[PDB]
Amino acid sequence: MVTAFILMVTAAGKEREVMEKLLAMPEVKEAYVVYGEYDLIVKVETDTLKDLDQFITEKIRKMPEIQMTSTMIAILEHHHHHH
Amino acid sequence: MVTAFILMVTAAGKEREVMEKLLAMPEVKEAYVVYGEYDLIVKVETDTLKDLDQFITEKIRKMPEIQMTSTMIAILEHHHHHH
Ligand SMILES: [K+]
Ligand SMILES: [K+]
């Protein structure tokens, strides 16, 4: 599984809008509007790296309200070499 | 209760050592080794902001392996209207 924590800057006044639009997506497990250097921190989980890159490409990158991002990934695979 | 995510830059090779020392702390609820702008992400809950401030500037300094932190205070999250 791949977990991504994405820090985001949004357009002014669109923080909650972005938070809820993201939470309506199945891949988004948690989301927080925050006070700090960024406006939100969002937790995403996908089965594969391919799934995460597709999620970012079709969802995140096509939401004009999201203006800046910083992505962090944790890959948790207990059998990465089991093929 | 205050909820926050502390993003950390750590010296290389000390992530898990620090992660385990962090997870053992009562304030620390979740910790993840990650790849990206930061090396470690930790979710903390404290009674007050003053407590969070002391954790960030005093407790974290007990681990010099942690070189930089940026903290995001949650002001809205996924339990809004959903609790
Ligand atoms: K969701
Ligand atoms: K703990």
* Sign of the CA dihedral with B28 first, then B59, B6, and B12 last: negative
Token pair 């007990």 in the structure block, residue: B62
CATH for A1-74, among 3.30.70.920, 3.40.1160.10, 3.30.230.70, 3.40.718.10? 3.30.70.920
Of the listed ligands, the closest to the CA of A24 is 1
Residue B62 gets which letter from DSSP? G
Under an 8 A CB cutoff, do A72 and B33 touch? no
Cα gap B12→B66, rounded to integer Å:
10
**Residue in chain A lying closest to B8 (CA):** A72
CA A72 to chain centre: 9
Experimental method: X-ray
Cβ-Cβ contacts under 8 Å, A71 against chain B: 36
Give the integer Cα–Cα distance in Å for B2 and B14: 27
The answer to whether the CB of B16 falls within 8 A of the CB of B33 is yes
B2-31 exposure pattern, b = at least 16 Cβ within 10 A, e = fewer: bbbbbbbebeeebbeebbebbeeeebbeeb
Q: Are A40 and B5 in contact (CB under 8 A)?
A: no
Q: Which of B45, B40, B8 is nearest to B25 (CA)?
A: B45
Closest residue by Cα to residue B6 from A82, B25, A60: B25
The rounded distance, in Å, linking the Cα atoms of B15 and B8 is 10
Interatomic CA distance for residues B12 and B29, integer angstroms: 23
Contact residues, chain A to chain B, C-beta under 8 Å:
3, 5, 7, 15-16, 19, 23, 30-38, 41, 70-74
Chain centre to alpha carbon of residue B83: 24
Q: What CA dihedral angle connects A62, A11, B71 and A50, to 10 degrees?
A: 0
Considering only CB atoms, B41 lies closest to which of A33, A35, A72, namely A72
Strands in A66-75's sheet, in edge-to-edge order, are A66-75, A2-10, A40-46, A28-35, B66-77, B2-10, B40-46, B28-33
β-partners of residue B33 are B40
Cα–Cα distance measured from residue B4 to residue B7, given in angstroms and rounded to the nearest whole number = 10
Q: Distance between CA B44 and CA B55 in Å, rounded?
A: 9
Distance B41 CA to ligand 2 centre (A): 14
